[PDB]
């Protein structure tokens, strides 16, 4: 009763309490007199957001709404998802962590460090969270290796947890954001009187894994129903973490496994639009890090699953370019393990020595696709795009490096140079480009398409672990959600605004695959697709006033 | 226990919980690992405030601290009071109300309007506030008649309540901010889809008083121990409200009665520094509204109390200037009632017709003091200040009109033109001025010097009403707090940073005057000054971690 209702963010409705409710609940006279519907409150909040000039102030306003009316916050995000995503997550959330970390103090963060060694389970038990479904953990080290946030990485976990709630209807009470503070190499923070985390350089690998092992074991006992999602871990650990834990715990890494699932789905739809079928594609992979090779391998895996081409033939469609040039077995260097499987076997040593610059590699390979995974700026030049037009009527051009500055080509330039023929997926949202009165707009491969549905599917099915089959099934599900209508209009993904339906379908297909593998621990679920889909949709938390 | 402690703004200490406390209270791992003292948290918050460029963003940050750690909020305000005052109150609070009213939604506002006629007492009863001490009420009409805020005036009540807590240690649980929404003449708001108040023009006087009468009667029954303070009411009502209620209820208006008390105290100290004793002063009162004449009458009342000069002789020191010129009985117009008592009787009709412009009025009157209450801009020109220097070695120059744009003269110009001789009180804070290596700084007559102590005194003594004697006693108390040391350094007031000691002394003297008049209802209090002062100081809420 009374102001206790208005100060409980889960049950407060604010001005959406009717006059009769206000009288019954002893809050008449604790609100201004106008009664609003939820939709009206959402419109009002959206204008309160747009009154702020800078993304950080927009973010700060949204935090205040999240603190006072959880339903209204999520309702606003769902009504304006494409516009809100860059504010509530990348890139604004990282700026909030780096310079405005006070914005996170009031949220339900859980903080581990070596001072609490042997107490991790007690800390989790004392949080008293029943039936936790999703745990996002970071060490603030950063996947893209820039701006080590240390303890302030808790804001990344908080923002990513919010995207599970918005995207897949994980109940906001059943998600936990975690920082594993193992120190920071951020020299500003190590000297900052106001930095509140462990004031020391990052722990060595042995001590790192002693603490992360205790975390995983503790979470498996106290939050046994949860999916553990690793977020924004640096490359020295993120791949090794997955090798250490993938079989033993219910866990995944969205940066590695989510990105590859999303990109693979859009890329296969791009091939469909091109008419140049997967075994006729000649794909330049610009960028040869572990992540880039992971994406190429996820594309090959998905095409093998959808079409039953032999995976060895799909691997021969890829031309991998590293900092030295085309990756070949005859180039004369010792290749990193991850580069060997995509290395050309069909290019002579004499040709390899002349295959160093991207322009000459493109002239020689005669690719039909450019995949930009390079992280080095605008490498897909006008001259390079005009060459791809010699090899296909519909060039597939994916500038996926973030931010927009590091991206290989603007979608605007790709469409202009190909006179509208380019099929484009981007890492960031871009405005439409109009050419000759015909409108083009890139398909953004947002990670939101996959991780929420994997979380909702793993929360419902309770699988023993998350093998590669479940991520491949999610990739396929996303691909197949793109309608004949969506494809006729050049879209590579289902629309982001339809994320609840997307997540419910991805989750359904993930659950069916866990059921086929007999790794599902929840025996209440339907085992046929139509009935399961309906069941999954009913399970989702929705940001509407319920009681 | 647990996060329930961290999410209770009255008991949360945040990072000031020791490691042992965190273990005992089940919040280990719900905070980053650094333990801070209160003083360290205050320093950190002050830097988080100064990271923001604009006052509104500074305000927004302070609101978030108020929402999460009440003790830390008030501790920060008390450590940086002079710098924070313009952010947490005038002029920032009015901009927050006018354009950022969402910042107030979560606070403990109480909202009345004609839809709730006959239910006011039930609304107050349902708020369940025990032993309420201070109620600030506004209708959002504005004393200075600009930017009618309507319902959004609740933020003015909220900010003013905060100043009672900071300035006099009114416990933050025992103060209530109230909006009496009687409509708005703000045409933007009447058309604004997002304005949440009564969407109609302001009620006529009869209906206005029917609702405000119900408010006063209801508050007298349900909040019987409270002082009711009227804030930011327009001139068509603010004086009439005091005539209607002053004898029947425990109420005052800070804009009228607080301002006059504060100005009178500083002005009497200015006379002391001048050596030109009160009966030798010749004072130009530039501005002849009801408020300006109220201030002159408060000066005369205070000098009569402190010195036992006959009040009629003190009235003859004032030369009142309205828009027509010098106010005289021989000028030929029918004077407003409030102008008649200060009208010159000693100036001929022929002289009156030549006493229109301030420069010629100053040449004729040969004043020793200029009181700027005009609200019309920089009327105290260089030529006018040089004339005052012909009549006194120490010109008293009080540019009190707000904002700094409407002010009669900059303190910098006053000190430069008088070569450091001017004795200056201001309506706003100004930086020091250095002349010939000697530093001068105006004394700001902030209303904070008086209303908190009147609230704390009236909360403790529980007087039947607040007669003019209590405000005069508060004015005198403030005057007498200015130390021989403060006066030797040119200060007209005790330092604002010492507001708790100031309020405790003002409250003590107010209580003694209520005891002398036998209007005090609290018989527990001491009746001698030393013992009462000690008792009052112990009663004050202080922003330190207590338990």
mmCIF file of N, CA and C in Angstrom, chain B residues 288-352:
data_model
loop_
_atom_site.group_PDB
_atom_site.id
_atom_site.type_symbol
_atom_site.label_atom_id
_atom_site.label_comp_id
_atom_site.label_asym_id
_atom_site.label_seq_id
_atom_site.Cartn_x
_atom_site.Cartn_y
_atom_site.Cartn_z
ATOM 1 N N UNK B 288 9.335 50.043 -5.310
ATOM 2 C CA UNK B 288 8.263 50.402 -4.371
ATOM 3 C C UNK B 288 7.122 49.387 -4.404
ATOM 4 N N UNK B 289 7.384 48.142 -4.772
ATOM 5 C CA UNK B 289 6.404 47.075 -4.582
ATOM 6 C C UNK B 289 6.154 46.784 -3.124
ATOM 7 N N UNK B 290 5.122 46.025 -2.825
ATOM 8 C CA UNK B 290 4.764 45.582 -1.454
ATOM 9 C C UNK B 290 5.963 44.915 -0.781
ATOM 10 N N UNK B 291 6.702 44.092 -1.509
ATOM 11 C CA UNK B 291 7.859 43.374 -0.945
ATOM 12 C C UNK B 291 8.940 44.384 -0.547
ATOM 13 N N UNK B 292 9.241 45.346 -1.391
ATOM 14 C CA UNK B 292 10.323 46.318 -1.131
ATOM 15 C C UNK B 292 9.945 47.141 0.103
ATOM 16 N N UNK B 293 8.683 47.532 0.190
ATOM 17 C CA UNK B 293 8.251 48.364 1.337
ATOM 18 C C UNK B 293 8.300 47.477 2.600
ATOM 19 N N UNK B 294 7.949 46.202 2.493
ATOM 20 C CA UNK B 294 8.114 45.194 3.573
ATOM 21 C C UNK B 294 9.550 45.129 4.076
ATOM 22 N N UNK B 295 10.525 45.139 3.210
ATOM 23 C CA UNK B 295 11.936 45.094 3.614
ATOM 24 C C UNK B 295 12.264 46.380 4.366
ATOM 25 N N UNK B 296 11.845 47.543 3.860
ATOM 26 C CA UNK B 296 12.185 48.794 4.552
ATOM 27 C C UNK B 296 11.549 48.764 5.943
ATOM 28 N N UNK B 297 10.316 48.339 6.048
ATOM 29 C CA UNK B 297 9.631 48.270 7.339
ATOM 30 C C UNK B 297 10.340 47.270 8.290
ATOM 31 N N UNK B 298 10.889 46.187 7.756
ATOM 32 C CA UNK B 298 11.632 45.194 8.574
ATOM 33 C C UNK B 298 12.960 45.792 9.083
ATOM 34 N N UNK B 299 13.633 46.604 8.270
ATOM 35 C CA UNK B 299 14.838 47.335 8.681
ATOM 36 C C UNK B 299 14.454 48.255 9.850
ATOM 37 N N UNK B 300 13.435 49.075 9.674
ATOM 38 C CA UNK B 300 13.022 50.027 10.735
ATOM 39 C C UNK B 300 12.652 49.287 12.027
ATOM 40 N N UNK B 301 11.918 48.191 11.884
ATOM 41 C CA UNK B 301 11.522 47.371 13.048
ATOM 42 C C UNK B 301 12.755 46.836 13.759
ATOM 43 N N UNK B 302 13.732 46.362 13.001
ATOM 44 C CA UNK B 302 14.899 45.758 13.630
ATOM 45 C C UNK B 302 15.710 46.855 14.324
ATOM 46 N N UNK B 303 15.934 48.010 13.658
ATOM 47 C CA UNK B 303 16.692 49.085 14.326
ATOM 48 C C UNK B 303 15.950 49.552 15.572
ATOM 49 N N UNK B 304 14.643 49.602 15.600
ATOM 50 C CA UNK B 304 13.886 50.022 16.788
ATOM 51 C C UNK B 304 14.113 48.986 17.889
ATOM 52 N N UNK B 305 14.084 47.714 17.540
ATOM 53 C CA UNK B 305 14.294 46.642 18.537
ATOM 54 C C UNK B 305 15.711 46.698 19.099
ATOM 55 N N UNK B 306 16.749 46.825 18.279
ATOM 56 C CA UNK B 306 18.123 46.690 18.708
ATOM 57 C C UNK B 306 18.568 47.947 19.466
ATOM 58 N N UNK B 307 18.006 49.112 19.126
ATOM 59 C CA UNK B 307 18.586 50.411 19.566
ATOM 60 C C UNK B 307 17.585 51.296 20.289
ATOM 61 N N UNK B 308 16.310 50.977 20.229
ATOM 62 C CA UNK B 308 15.203 51.726 20.886
ATOM 63 C C UNK B 308 15.232 53.156 20.362
ATOM 64 N N UNK B 309 15.549 53.350 19.095
ATOM 65 C CA UNK B 309 15.138 54.601 18.425
ATOM 66 C C UNK B 309 13.648 54.572 18.186
ATOM 67 N N UNK B 310 13.004 55.742 18.222
ATOM 68 C CA UNK B 310 11.607 55.777 17.861
ATOM 69 C C UNK B 310 11.379 55.409 16.384
ATOM 70 N N UNK B 311 10.480 54.464 16.154
ATOM 71 C CA UNK B 311 10.311 53.900 14.790
ATOM 72 C C UNK B 311 9.922 55.019 13.809
ATOM 73 N N UNK B 312 9.163 56.011 14.224
ATOM 74 C CA UNK B 312 8.764 57.132 13.329
ATOM 75 C C UNK B 312 10.016 57.839 12.835
ATOM 76 N N UNK B 313 11.058 58.001 13.652
ATOM 77 C CA UNK B 313 12.275 58.682 13.197
ATOM 78 C C UNK B 313 12.998 57.768 12.212
ATOM 79 N N UNK B 314 12.991 56.449 12.425
ATOM 80 C CA UNK B 314 13.664 55.546 11.463
ATOM 81 C C UNK B 314 12.951 55.558 10.114
ATOM 82 N N UNK B 315 11.620 55.617 10.117
ATOM 83 C CA UNK B 315 10.840 55.714 8.846
ATOM 84 C C UNK B 315 11.264 56.948 8.024
ATOM 85 N N UNK B 316 11.598 58.050 8.653
ATOM 86 C CA UNK B 316 12.021 59.311 7.995
ATOM 87 C C UNK B 316 13.411 59.157 7.379
ATOM 88 N N UNK B 317 14.134 58.060 7.602
ATOM 89 C CA UNK B 317 15.423 57.851 6.896
ATOM 90 C C UNK B 317 15.198 57.316 5.485
ATOM 91 N N UNK B 318 14.001 56.876 5.111
ATOM 92 C CA UNK B 318 13.731 56.186 3.830
ATOM 93 C C UNK B 318 13.165 57.150 2.793
ATOM 94 N N UNK B 319 13.727 57.058 1.599
ATOM 95 C CA UNK B 319 13.297 57.822 0.391
ATOM 96 C C UNK B 319 12.908 56.761 -0.625
ATOM 97 N N UNK B 320 11.618 56.565 -0.818
ATOM 98 C CA UNK B 320 11.071 55.492 -1.624
ATOM 99 C C UNK B 320 10.944 55.987 -3.073
ATOM 100 N N UNK B 321 11.515 55.255 -4.013
ATOM 101 C CA UNK B 321 11.409 55.567 -5.456
ATOM 102 C C UNK B 321 10.576 54.485 -6.153
ATOM 103 N N UNK B 322 9.475 54.900 -6.772
ATOM 104 C CA UNK B 322 8.648 54.043 -7.645
ATOM 105 C C UNK B 322 8.961 54.406 -9.109
ATOM 106 N N UNK B 323 8.212 53.824 -10.044
ATOM 107 C CA UNK B 323 8.367 54.057 -11.512
ATOM 108 C C UNK B 323 8.139 55.532 -11.878
ATOM 109 N N UNK B 324 7.367 56.275 -11.103
ATOM 110 C CA UNK B 324 7.133 57.728 -11.374
ATOM 111 C C UNK B 324 8.250 58.604 -10.815
ATOM 112 N N UNK B 325 8.929 58.171 -9.736
ATOM 113 C CA UNK B 325 10.041 58.908 -9.153
ATOM 114 C C UNK B 325 9.994 58.853 -7.635
ATOM 115 N N UNK B 326 10.423 59.934 -6.983
ATOM 116 C CA UNK B 326 10.422 59.947 -5.505
ATOM 117 C C UNK B 326 8.982 59.914 -5.032
ATOM 118 N N UNK B 327 8.658 59.027 -4.107
ATOM 119 C CA UNK B 327 7.285 58.950 -3.532
ATOM 120 C C UNK B 327 7.133 60.053 -2.485
ATOM 121 N N UNK B 328 6.218 61.018 -2.727
ATOM 122 C CA UNK B 328 5.945 62.162 -1.821
ATOM 123 C C UNK B 328 4.439 62.385 -1.740
ATOM 124 N N UNK B 329 4.037 63.049 -0.670
ATOM 125 C CA UNK B 329 2.604 63.368 -0.452
ATOM 126 C C UNK B 329 2.198 64.561 -1.329
ATOM 127 N N UNK B 330 3.155 65.236 -1.973
ATOM 128 C CA UNK B 330 2.857 66.465 -2.758
ATOM 129 C C UNK B 330 3.006 66.274 -4.268
ATOM 130 N N UNK B 331 3.226 65.042 -4.720
ATOM 131 C CA UNK B 331 3.461 64.648 -6.123
ATOM 132 C C UNK B 331 2.177 64.742 -6.963
ATOM 133 N N UNK B 332 0.978 64.632 -6.362
ATOM 134 C CA UNK B 332 -0.317 64.822 -7.060
ATOM 135 C C UNK B 332 -1.060 63.545 -7.458
ATOM 136 N N UNK B 333 -0.491 62.352 -7.279
ATOM 137 C CA UNK B 333 -1.178 61.062 -7.561
ATOM 138 C C UNK B 333 -1.814 60.526 -6.270
ATOM 139 N N UNK B 334 -2.731 59.567 -6.402
ATOM 140 C CA UNK B 334 -3.287 58.768 -5.283
ATOM 141 C C UNK B 334 -2.336 57.592 -5.057
ATOM 142 N N UNK B 335 -1.683 57.569 -3.911
ATOM 143 C CA UNK B 335 -0.668 56.511 -3.640
ATOM 144 C C UNK B 335 -1.359 55.216 -3.218
ATOM 145 N N UNK B 336 -0.863 54.074 -3.705
ATOM 146 C CA UNK B 336 -1.154 52.739 -3.134
ATOM 147 C C UNK B 336 -0.933 52.771 -1.618
ATOM 148 N N UNK B 337 -1.736 52.030 -0.859
ATOM 149 C CA UNK B 337 -1.649 51.962 0.611
ATOM 150 C C UNK B 337 -0.205 51.697 1.076
ATOM 151 N N UNK B 338 0.523 50.795 0.414
ATOM 152 C CA UNK B 338 1.832 50.339 0.935
ATOM 153 C C UNK B 338 2.850 51.469 0.737
ATOM 154 N N UNK B 339 2.603 52.406 -0.196
ATOM 155 C CA UNK B 339 3.579 53.502 -0.470
ATOM 156 C C UNK B 339 3.366 54.662 0.499
ATOM 157 N N UNK B 340 2.185 54.812 1.072
ATOM 158 C CA UNK B 340 1.867 56.021 1.880
ATOM 159 C C UNK B 340 2.739 56.122 3.122
ATOM 160 N N UNK B 341 3.031 55.037 3.827
ATOM 161 C CA UNK B 341 3.697 55.250 5.130
ATOM 162 C C UNK B 341 5.144 55.737 4.898
ATOM 163 N N UNK B 342 5.763 55.406 3.753
ATOM 164 C CA UNK B 342 7.156 55.837 3.472
ATOM 165 C C UNK B 342 7.196 57.106 2.615
ATOM 166 N N UNK B 343 6.064 57.606 2.196
ATOM 167 C CA UNK B 343 6.018 58.848 1.391
ATOM 168 C C UNK B 343 6.631 60.025 2.155
ATOM 169 N N UNK B 344 7.478 60.800 1.480
ATOM 170 C CA UNK B 344 8.019 62.030 2.054
ATOM 171 C C UNK B 344 6.851 62.993 2.300
ATOM 172 N N UNK B 345 6.887 63.622 3.468
ATOM 173 C CA UNK B 345 6.004 64.762 3.854
ATOM 174 C C UNK B 345 6.760 66.096 3.755
ATOM 175 N N UNK B 346 8.073 66.079 3.517
ATOM 176 C CA UNK B 346 8.995 67.224 3.656
ATOM 177 C C UNK B 346 9.497 67.674 2.270
ATOM 178 N N UNK B 347 8.819 67.290 1.204
ATOM 179 C CA UNK B 347 9.268 67.669 -0.160
ATOM 180 C C UNK B 347 8.092 68.373 -0.822
ATOM 181 N N UNK B 348 8.367 69.563 -1.332
ATOM 182 C CA UNK B 348 7.320 70.430 -1.935
ATOM 183 C C UNK B 348 6.838 69.797 -3.230
ATOM 184 N N UNK B 349 5.689 70.253 -3.710
ATOM 185 C CA UNK B 349 5.129 69.837 -5.015
ATOM 186 C C UNK B 349 6.110 70.231 -6.139
ATOM 187 N N UNK B 350 6.756 71.393 -6.031
ATOM 188 C CA UNK B 350 7.646 71.951 -7.103
ATOM 189 C C UNK B 350 8.874 71.039 -7.184
ATOM 190 N N UNK B 351 9.392 70.662 -6.022
ATOM 191 C CA UNK B 351 10.553 69.723 -5.963
ATOM 192 C C UNK B 351 10.117 68.347 -6.468
ATOM 193 N N UNK B 352 8.943 67.835 -6.092
ATOM 194 C CA UNK B 352 8.443 66.514 -6.530
ATOM 195 C C UNK B 352 8.426 66.407 -8.048
#
